[PDB]
Structure 1
Amino acid sequence: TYTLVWKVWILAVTLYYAIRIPLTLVFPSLFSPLLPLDILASLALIADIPLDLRLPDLLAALPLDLLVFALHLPSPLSLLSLVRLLKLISVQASATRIINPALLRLLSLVGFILLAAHGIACGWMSLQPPSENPAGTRYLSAFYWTITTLTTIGYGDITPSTPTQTVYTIVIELLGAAMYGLVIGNIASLVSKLDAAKLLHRERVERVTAFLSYKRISPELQRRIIEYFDYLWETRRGYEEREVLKELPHPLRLAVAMEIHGDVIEKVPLFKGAGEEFIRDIILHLEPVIYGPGEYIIRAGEMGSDVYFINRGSVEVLSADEKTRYAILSEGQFFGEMALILRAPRTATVRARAFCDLYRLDKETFDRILSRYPEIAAQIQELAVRRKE
């Protein structure tokens, strides 16, 4: 598309105006050689209102410039040529519609302050006696004074000497030295929001760890609490899927979930090739859970019935005691299905070989699934009746 190119070009034109117009207000020797480079940017300003896809555009586009300097209008009225700076109040919002915004906003404030400093320096250069000095060093001194005043440092090596300069510096010391604190506060607060996810996984971890270390916790447990937390930050960046997705409506949430959980989908044998309405009914009820190594899930005799679907990692099935391990299950399989099918207590124990994450599904949705969909229930039936040895 070319809308990005046009927006970048408009930004370039409105920065050209911002840098140029006060500087040519101070020095009238310009605008004679820079004339050909101004008509193009002026006709590229009235051609932006038709490209709607608004009062700033109406006021700023009309060529109020190029005549103020033409008729050589005197000084108390020549300040009305400054209205071509009103594109910024819209550009700062239109540039947002393109990169993390917490980054685009951070930069826009920085340019703004470097434009305000230039404008104030050009203002201070004007109301001075005519001194036979080069223009470049005069601008350097004016900008040095403006940065000294705005930062509330105040060296005092160069200070006002006339009542007009005194009033001007009072106005600056109030206004600019207030917005510098304001903009620096905003930027300082918004730098701390570049991370967002790192901060919460750290606040949560510190909150848990302070309480754990306050008590006389053995080193072993304290080893695992910090390993799980690191695993969660690595694989999920501290995000909470549920907590994010209860802001969206139901169809958008379903569409997002069917792509987010698309890894466990087409992995287990019994989901793919089993219709498209079952896969929509069951996708929202799959919830993630993490079990670390050397940790138990089923303890062979408990109530409840919660099928567990292996996403990543290997799970090991054991008896009610340590003896006679049956087998080992891997990625894309599941276990714990006959607790509700046969109406019997748990008949085996399961551990985790490594950091394996897996999806747990409740009993109510599961027995509703059995009561509604016959052939999937039959497949579970034959798998359970075969799994008897």
Structure 2
Amino acid sequence: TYTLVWKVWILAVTLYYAIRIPLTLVFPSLFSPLLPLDILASLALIADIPLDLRLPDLLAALPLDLLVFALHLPSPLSLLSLVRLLKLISVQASATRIINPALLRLLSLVGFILLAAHGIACGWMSLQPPSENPAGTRYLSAFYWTITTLTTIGYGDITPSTPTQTVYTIVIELLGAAMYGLVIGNIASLVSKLDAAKLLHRERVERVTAFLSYKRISPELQRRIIEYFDYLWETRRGYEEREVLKELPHPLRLAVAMEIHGDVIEKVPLFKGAGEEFIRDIILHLEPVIYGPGEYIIRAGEMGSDVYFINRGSVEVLSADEKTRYAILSEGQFFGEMALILRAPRTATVRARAFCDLYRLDKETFDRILSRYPEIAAQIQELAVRRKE
């Protein structure tokens, strides 16, 4: 690729102007060594209108720079040489078309502060009287004053002394010390905006835990829920698969679900090779669910028939009481299907042996796909009639 390099070179050039132009405006001793670099940048400035596949980018290309510096034009006209800074408000969104978007918006709001402070400090040095000082010390004092004023510290060791400096200080205090607070608050808001899934899950578990304690609850149950919440966060990161997909259209939701539940399909024997249209029919009706250890799922005698497709874990299916346990199931298997095949209530208790994660499909869709597909119905029928001993 080459857009990723071109839009980085453009950023490095529009920052080069943003740093160099005011420093040349205050120090006329420059522009002698830095002319080839400036023209090499400007030819790239005019080399972007053809590569457009709005108006601020048009203003930036015209070279008012190279003219004011060459003709030592008077200060009021020359101050308008800042038109090349208009690419800054046209690139921060053009360079956004490329990591976390929130992270790019924290780095962008810093560079803006460090450029505005440099501009204000450079403007402040221009209004001071002519003194025989090194450029480094004179710039350091101006930057120190600008950081003191913007942060609203106000040491007062150096202060304006002339009416024009007083007016400049008033303007900077009025509309520079308030915008800094806005940018700092935005930086705080979008550094808090990071990893919001953790900040949501933590708030949820705190809200649950507060109530589980006003009503005093046995520690053997109080610690059993924290384990489940830790497991849910540790296997799912607090994300929920329903509210995220609520806004996507049904074909796009179908395409996403074809990717997320890519593990349970083609794992159980009767999903791989079952076709394409059946899996497309059923992929939107399976819910994740998590069952803890020693935690019953089927109680051997109630109504209803929900089938549990095991994704990971193991169950310990038993009769009414223990009495020589029937068998054990593992990953890539399912149970609880013959309650609807034989139109009979549950015949055996099922309890998990570890933190099982498994997918449940309701009775309604199951009977629909029994009445809709013959091979699947025949397979479940023969498996149910065979598993009777």
Distance in structure 2 (CA, Å) of the matches to 1:21 and 1:383: 80
**Alpha-carbon offset, residue 324 of structure 1:** 2.2
1:92-142 CA-partner distances (Å, limit 9, x unpaired)? 111211110010000000000000000000000001110001011000000
Distance in structure 1 (CA, Å) of the matches to 2:278 and 2:220: 43
**Alpha-carbon offset, residue 53 of structure 1:** 1.6
- After TM superposition, the structure 1 stretch with the greater mean CA deviation from structure 2, 67-76 or 369-378, is 67-76
Distance in structure 1 (CA, Å) of the matches to 2:185 and 2:193: 13
* Consecutive unaligned residues in structure 1, runs of 5 or more: none
Distance in structure 2 (CA, Å) of the matches to 1:196 and 1:96: 21
The number of aligned residues is 389
1:155-195 CA-partner distances (Å, limit 9, x unpaired)? 11110000000000000011110110000010011111111
**Alpha-carbon offset, residue 28 of structure 1:** 0.4
1:321-356 CA-partner distances (Å, limit 9, x unpaired)? 122210000000010011111001100001010101
**Alpha-carbon offset, residue 213 of structure 1:** 1.1
SS of 1:86's partner is helix
**Alpha-carbon offset, residue 50 of structure 1:** 1.2
**Alpha-carbon offset, residue 216 of structure 1:** 0.9
Distance in structure 2 (CA, Å) of the matches to 1:345 and 1:30: 91
SS of 1:357's partner is strand
SS of 2:316's partner is strand
Distance in structure 1 (CA, Å) of the matches to 2:316 and 2:170: 77
1:247 corresponding residue in structure 2? 247
**Alpha-carbon offset, residue 294 of structure 1:** 0.8
SS of 2:231's partner is helix
SS of 2:178's partner is helix
1:264-284 CA-partner distances (Å, limit 9, x unpaired)? 111101110111100100011
Distance in structure 1 (CA, Å) of the matches to 2:236 and 2:43: 51
- After TM superposition, the structure 1 stretch with the greater mean CA deviation from structure 2, 91-100 or 331-340, is 91-100
For normalisation by structure 1, the TM-score amounts to: 0.99
**Alpha-carbon offset, residue 247 of structure 1:** 1.0
2:65 corresponding residue in structure 1? 65
**Alpha-carbon offset, residue 223 of structure 1:** 1.1
- The runs of at least 4 aligned residues of structure 1 exceeding 6 Å deviation read none
Distance in structure 2 (CA, Å) of the matches to 1:294 and 1:240: 25
2:160 corresponding residue in structure 1? 160
Query: What are the residue-to-residue correspondences of 1:107-256 with 2, within 5 Å?
Result: 107-256=107-256
For normalisation by structure 2, the TM-score amounts to: 0.99
Distance in structure 1 (CA, Å) of the matches to 2:294 and 2:314: 12
SS of 2:115's partner is helix
Q: Identity across aligned pairs (percent)?
A: 100
SS of 1:20's partner is helix
2:375 corresponding residue in structure 1? 375
SS of 1:301's partner is coil
**Alpha-carbon offset, residue 83 of structure 1:** 0.8
**Alpha-carbon offset, residue 385 of structure 1:** 1.0
Distance in structure 2 (CA, Å) of the matches to 1:49 and 1:136: 38
1:205-243 CA-partner distances (Å, limit 9, x unpaired)? 001000001111000111111011000001100011011
